[PDB]
Design a protein around this ligand. Sequence first.
Ligand code: DME
Lengths: 537, 531
Amino acid sequence: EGREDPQLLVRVRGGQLRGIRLKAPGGPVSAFLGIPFAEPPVGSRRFMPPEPKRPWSGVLDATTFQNVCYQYVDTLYPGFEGTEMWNPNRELSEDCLYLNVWTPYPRPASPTPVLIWIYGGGFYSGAASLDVYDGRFLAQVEGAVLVSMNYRVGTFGFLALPGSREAPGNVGLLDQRLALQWVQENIAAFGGDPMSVTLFGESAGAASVGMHILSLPSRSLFHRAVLQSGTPNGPWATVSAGEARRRATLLARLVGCPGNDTELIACLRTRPAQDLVDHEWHVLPQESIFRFSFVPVVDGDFLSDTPEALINTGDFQDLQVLVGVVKDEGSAFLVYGVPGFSKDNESLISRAQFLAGVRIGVPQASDLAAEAVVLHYTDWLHPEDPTHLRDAMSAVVGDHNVVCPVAQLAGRLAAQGARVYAYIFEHRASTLTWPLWMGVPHGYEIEFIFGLPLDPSLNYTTEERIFAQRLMKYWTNFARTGDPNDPRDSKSPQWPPYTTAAQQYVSLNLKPLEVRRGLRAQTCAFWNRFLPKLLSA
Amino acid sequence: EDPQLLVRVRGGQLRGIRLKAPGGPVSAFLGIPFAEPPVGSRRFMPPEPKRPWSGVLDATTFQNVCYQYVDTLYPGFEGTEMWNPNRELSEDCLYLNVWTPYPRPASPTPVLIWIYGGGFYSGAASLDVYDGRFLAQVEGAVLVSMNYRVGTFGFLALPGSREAPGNVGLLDQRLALQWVQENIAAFGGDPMSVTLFGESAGAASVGMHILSLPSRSLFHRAVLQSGTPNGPWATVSAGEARRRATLLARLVGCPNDTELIACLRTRPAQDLVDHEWHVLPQESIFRFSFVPVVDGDFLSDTPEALINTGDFQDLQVLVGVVKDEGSAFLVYGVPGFSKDNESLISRAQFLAGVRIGVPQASDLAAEAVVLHYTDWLHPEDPTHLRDAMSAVVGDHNVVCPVAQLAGRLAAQGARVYAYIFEHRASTLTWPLWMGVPHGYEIEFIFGLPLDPSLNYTTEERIFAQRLMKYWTNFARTGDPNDPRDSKSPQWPPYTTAAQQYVSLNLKPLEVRRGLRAQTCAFWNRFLPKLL
Ligand SMILES: C[N+](C)(C)CCCCCCCCCC[N+](C)(C)C
């Protein structure tokens, strides 16, 4: 300990940690990377709820990110930045339950609001160690204390035989909850305020934030929530108990595992990690995009009912939420399975290809429902136009899966006492390597929120760097106060709360805040109010 | 004896009357018999041609109006009285009217034939709004209008029977059409240039002559104003007509087909009219009990099947709608609606209204209509709900059937011109909220604003002149554009890709694209697949 930097030695419940002094553009920050918050969920602990980390002795080195949770690695376009930046940047292992802390350097004098980030990746991938999730900018410029955790994905995190003890389901949400409990117990050691914790997340991260909102034990572990482009309701974020059982049973069958729950899980346990990954996609009921095999399950425990039933009957009075979407939520998903679509051409499609694409984007639709979608999205002045058909296909996937479930969520939370703020994110990064026709794709607001444009060596424009500063300001103000608006700041335009009466939300882009009314309101009535009844009768 | 008012037709000699038009004299020949009176045992039967007469037949007045229900919703109000019979009611009513220039056209003149509307249960060729003198005088047109049988009298069918075969009101129209072929040259008309035009049930009539072979050699061009033979109200199936005829008979104490019609023929006219409205299967508006039947004869198949398979290559058609087709219909049955208040309604009332406006809708289809017409920023605003109700009725019954017809005729070789009429008459007595109601362009097409004693504005007099010019240019050439006027924009043909149509209002022609295209996709393409 003699010669170490005194500002980097911290004790937590399990013992002593040494962090690292990192350079941010404006000055130094403190990082504590790869803190274990759980016993390594390996061997007989696969599929199992996580157990609190046993204390170590000596000084645990927390200067590097730890292993990423075992997952499928995207290889659709090897070498391409657009996909590689989401791929694991550390070795895969089932031994992966670690979290990461960024704080100002020196650590703040007085209790500081805490941001907890939950990554996305369809519940089958992701990592808290990705460059785009780097907490140094928020820690340095805003003084934030930032935490992000690994949680198990795919089979390891969500394979379930509901009702059993050996694979209860939702263990990936349980990992996240453990990390939240860790933050309650330990964040003060870092100068964080456990009495002011904001969750934020994008995609499946956002659906996770959503599920902590809807799960009572989690509710005492945070105060405010930010859902970016993801919701707990909707067609992909959860499965019924029955459907989870079918999928788990089929996967077991496909890897050579024969009847009752104990035998079946013991055999899966047993199989090499890569084996479960190699077969994970084979268990989906239909040809489809935006569907993932192993997701949170409606177990009657972590989720005591469907998310739809819970948002409809909950009282959300003590709650402040920020929710929003990007302009082109669906575009990037199309190249993963809709024929006619590719990142290396303009992807102009015919009416045939559009109808075939709808059956893949809306796998649960009968021929009547699919016709309804195709008719709703047709441009009747130019019904054969391949540019519009291509943008229709993107909007279908984007609206059904993200925009309309978000609009629905905002509407329910507002109606039942929550303070809600809503945005559509509309700026395409000058650095984006996906094609122009993809517009502003899923995930590309992250990036600005974490303030990467502030790095002089990333080649963003000055306007983009200013924009990043604005977004960090809204996000941390929300964390700080429950309100994204700057209280001191006279000259600026105000971001109003979303309400059922006025349906007000804001545009985030290079221009000042513009207030808009109704979030794809006509189309969301189609998806949220009409389409369900069609699929019912 | 004025020689310009003496004409010899095939049935004998006729004498008309010199009328005053603001510009000058016209010749009128009113009450020319074109058929034997369909009385007694000819009730419900095809018309037979009129027997020859002797001496000189006095054709100087409108004859009886065909027996029909008379609207008593608002007694003595102009808005409804102007559509009511203005002559005596009678089963003896098969008379037609002819206006020509004075003196009579020197050279063969294109002929316009007017077929009145009135839901197939009413109307007369004798209403002031159908006055042919203006078109005759200003544009030099030969105009013909005929009475045809309506209600039980024109349309009660026992399909398959000798004695009530159905569609006899259309056969009356056809007989008047053949009569024009045989006689109009005596008036200086050109039997080689005949244009049908009609509004509402009369537009549906025109459309049926387009879809019926024997009619097709009696006219060259057609105008369909605010109605079509396709759509939910213009035809019934053979089975549905038999159901209705049998029910009417039962309601009047009658009694095999022969015995049932025999007893119906013994019933006074008014006893039949009395129970006319009790036979509809559902409480509804924009539905009429006795309309053309798909008999397998006049109509060899449903209008939809016929427009989908027809070759319409030698045909020109003008079609259009007024801006607020459904509004006038709401006060005739929808709870919450009245001409004497602003008719602000609730959401509950909108759905109750949809059940009456779209009577064939299931709960789910009714929900689809309601969801589609809702304004999602103000889902409770009473003004929008009221206007939506009007749009549901207008789109479902008129606008979207018109769009379908236009699309099909153009896809299959017809030259098609389409319009939306958007001028509300300064003289109109319906309330402002009704906008521009069903029927209210006829006024202008006939050129009534050219009458100084009616005091339309000067701008309306000019407007009326433009529309008379369009309509007769079209009758003259199958194209409403003025073949010597070198002025923009030209009214372009409606085609299935560009979907160009024009708005007729006080301002010059504006070309628009897509006739409520999104909404018509809902009615024409989704909603049927739903039921
Ligand atoms: C591998 N298969 C074909 C079986 C499934 C791939 C699932 C699609 C992944 C989403 C792509 C969006 C990219 C950007 N992010 C995820 C960051 C928003």
